[PDB]
């Protein structure tokens, strides 16, 4: 049972950590940990419908869709990650576009981007590096008009070099694999992990920093997420942080390019909230549950 496992885990971690808290403090951390954590006992994926008619899977461990059912998967790729990134604009002028892709998933963002990028300029050479700890063998295929392009990408996984296209999806943990990427400054980072409470390793200040080294200054970092913790971390690293919407808003970041701007209530929350904390993996070797626990401890000023 998840509850049982999680409580043990927490109790166990606190002892290792040698933290001291009140009972009230303990109760509260546990209550939130139980509510925000994922399902470590589960694994596998389940097929599901999406509003725009594309398919997605639900990941049983994370308890989340690869893509938002409410938006539709193509629509999310397009409006949360492709457009806001601005690669399509850059494309007409440019001869190369580089994308850093965080979480290969079913390959939707990449496929959606490539269709547009190529429509805009057929001759563009595209460099993609992606990170995927759990590559799949069966993928739901995108409906037309993205089916051709999707299958084309899938054929080329995981390593491909071509006139137009360079692809590397590096299997394993991104935290490990990222250090290998050198001499790459991305035009776009598509940061598409499962949600931060769910998938904590990929949203720490520490990981984001590694991402930072790999982004062109005028490049854009995009995610569906508007997590306060994530935004606060981006600000810490020097990004300009902004919002994208197709109501739930996303985040757009750049070190030096312009970003659309958040809105008054967004700023307020960011200033006001207890939850506007970074999240922390300093060695980058931490267990995901742990990263979450550490966060709750900070948030609740047990620390
Ligand atoms: C939101 S999904 C991917 C959706 C995908 N971007 C798409 O466009 O179709 C999250 C992906 O991140 C991967 N992931 C989660 N944690 C990871 C880690 N530490 N390292 C690498 N990949 C991870 C998951 O296995 C999953 O493939």
Automatic annotation (TrEMBL):
Keywords: S-adenosyl-L-methionine. GO terms for molecular function: oxidoreductase activity, acting on the CH-NH group of donors. InterPro entries: MnmC-like_methylTransf, SAM-dependent_MTases_sf. It comes from the Bacteria. It holds the Pfam family Methyltransf_30. S-adenosyl-L-methionine binds at residues 106, 108-109, 132, 173-174, 199, 201. Residues 159-255 form the MnmC-like methyltransferase domain. PANTHER family: MNMC-LIKE METHYLTRANSFERASE DOMAIN-CONTAINING PROTEIN (PTHR39963:SF1), SLL0983 PROTEIN (PTHR39963). This is MnmC-like methyltransferase domain-containing protein. It comes from Aquifex aeolicus (strain VF5). The lineage of its organism: Bacteria, Pseudomonadati, Aquificota, Aquificia, Aquificales.
